[PDB]
Protein backbone atom coordinates (compact mmCIF):
# COMPACT_ATOMS: atom_id res chain seq x y z
CA UNK A 1 0.00 0.00 0.00
CA UNK A 2 1.58 3.22 -1.30
CA UNK A 3 4.59 1.00 -1.98
CA UNK A 4 5.78 3.68 -4.38
CA UNK A 5 8.84 4.96 -2.50
CA UNK A 6 9.43 1.36 -1.34
CA UNK A 7 9.67 -0.40 -4.71
CA UNK A 8 11.57 2.55 -6.22
CA UNK A 9 14.08 2.07 -3.39
CA UNK A 10 14.36 -1.69 -3.85
CA UNK A 11 15.23 -1.00 -7.50
CA UNK A 12 18.05 1.39 -6.60
CA UNK A 13 19.26 -0.99 -3.89
CA UNK A 14 19.24 -3.82 -6.44
CA UNK A 15 21.45 -1.58 -8.59
CA UNK A 16 24.20 -1.02 -6.01
CA UNK A 17 24.05 -4.74 -5.23
CA UNK A 18 24.74 -5.33 -8.93
CA UNK A 19 27.63 -2.84 -8.91
CA UNK A 20 29.13 -4.49 -5.81
CA UNK A 21 29.01 -7.82 -7.64
CA UNK A 22 30.65 -6.28 -10.72
CA UNK A 23 33.43 -4.76 -8.59
CA UNK A 24 34.10 -8.02 -6.74
CA UNK A 25 34.25 -9.76 -10.12
CA UNK A 26 37.00 -7.33 -11.14
CA UNK A 27 38.70 -7.98 -7.79
CA UNK A 28 38.47 -11.74 -8.36
CA UNK A 29 40.00 -11.25 -11.82
CA UNK A 30 42.89 -9.54 -10.03
CA UNK A 31 43.37 -12.51 -7.69
CA UNK A 32 43.43 -15.14 -10.44
CA UNK A 33 46.17 -13.08 -12.08
CA UNK A 34 48.21 -13.29 -8.88
CA UNK A 35 47.85 -17.06 -8.49
CA UNK A 36 48.75 -17.67 -12.14
CA UNK A 37 51.78 -15.37 -11.81
CA UNK A 38 52.87 -16.96 -8.52
CA UNK A 39 52.50 -20.36 -10.21
CA UNK A 40 54.54 -19.24 -13.23
CA UNK A 41 57.47 -18.66 -10.84
CA UNK A 42 57.23 -22.21 -9.48
CA UNK B 1 2.27 -4.02 -9.72
CA UNK B 2 2.60 -7.66 -10.76
CA UNK B 3 4.87 -6.51 -13.61
CA UNK B 4 7.44 -4.71 -11.44
CA UNK B 5 7.28 -7.20 -8.56
CA UNK B 6 7.67 -9.85 -11.26
CA UNK B 7 10.82 -8.06 -12.43
CA UNK B 8 12.11 -7.18 -8.96
CA UNK B 9 11.72 -10.83 -7.95
CA UNK B 10 13.41 -11.90 -11.20
CA UNK B 11 16.37 -9.67 -10.35
CA UNK B 12 16.67 -11.26 -6.90
CA UNK B 13 17.14 -14.58 -8.69
CA UNK B 14 19.62 -13.10 -11.17
CA UNK B 15 21.64 -11.47 -8.38
CA UNK B 16 21.51 -14.70 -6.37
CA UNK B 17 22.80 -16.89 -9.21
CA UNK B 18 25.67 -14.47 -9.83
CA UNK B 19 26.62 -14.82 -6.15
CA UNK B 20 26.67 -18.63 -6.35
CA UNK B 21 28.90 -18.67 -9.43
CA UNK B 22 31.13 -16.07 -7.75
CA UNK B 23 31.40 -18.38 -4.74
CA UNK B 24 32.52 -21.16 -7.09
CA UNK B 25 35.29 -18.84 -8.30
CA UNK B 26 36.30 -18.00 -4.72
CA UNK B 27 36.64 -21.67 -3.76
CA UNK B 28 38.98 -22.23 -6.71
CA UNK B 29 41.18 -19.25 -5.82
CA UNK B 30 41.35 -20.53 -2.23
CA UNK B 31 42.34 -23.88 -3.76
CA UNK B 32 45.17 -22.35 -5.78
CA UNK B 33 46.45 -20.33 -2.82
CA UNK B 34 46.56 -23.38 -0.54
CA UNK B 35 48.28 -25.48 -3.21
CA UNK B 36 50.98 -22.81 -3.48
CA UNK B 37 51.17 -22.16 0.27
CA UNK B 38 51.64 -25.86 1.05
CA UNK B 39 54.72 -25.74 -1.21
CA UNK B 40 56.54 -22.99 0.75
Amino acid sequence: VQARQLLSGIVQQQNNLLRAIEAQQHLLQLTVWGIKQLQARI
Amino acid sequence: ARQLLSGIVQQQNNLLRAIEAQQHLLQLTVWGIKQLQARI
Binding site: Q25 | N14, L25, W31
Partner: peptide, 30 residues
Protein backbone atom coordinates in the same frame (compact mmCIF):
# COMPACT_ATOMS: atom_id res chain seq x y z
CA UNK C 1 40.24 -30.64 -7.73
CA UNK C 2 43.27 -30.39 -10.01
CA UNK C 3 45.43 -27.74 -11.69
CA UNK C 4 44.56 -28.65 -15.28
CA UNK C 5 40.90 -28.61 -14.19
CA UNK C 6 41.45 -25.40 -12.20
CA UNK C 7 42.26 -23.54 -15.41
CA UNK C 8 39.16 -25.12 -16.98
CA UNK C 9 36.70 -24.35 -14.17
CA UNK C 10 38.07 -20.82 -13.73
CA UNK C 11 37.38 -19.92 -17.36
CA UNK C 12 33.92 -21.51 -17.43
CA UNK C 13 32.76 -20.04 -14.12
CA UNK C 14 34.15 -16.66 -15.18
CA UNK C 15 31.91 -16.69 -18.26
CA UNK C 16 28.91 -17.91 -16.25
CA UNK C 17 29.16 -14.77 -14.11
CA UNK C 18 29.71 -12.37 -17.02
CA UNK C 19 26.55 -13.62 -18.73
CA UNK C 20 24.65 -13.32 -15.44
CA UNK C 21 25.93 -9.74 -15.08
CA UNK C 22 24.81 -8.96 -18.63
CA UNK C 23 21.45 -10.50 -17.72
CA UNK C 24 21.31 -8.48 -14.49
CA UNK C 25 22.22 -5.24 -16.28
CA UNK C 26 19.38 -5.72 -18.77
CA UNK C 27 16.85 -6.54 -16.05
CA UNK C 28 18.10 -3.48 -14.14
CA UNK C 29 17.12 -1.06 -16.93
CA UNK C 30 13.45 -1.06 -15.84
Amino acid sequence: MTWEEWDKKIEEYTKKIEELIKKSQNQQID
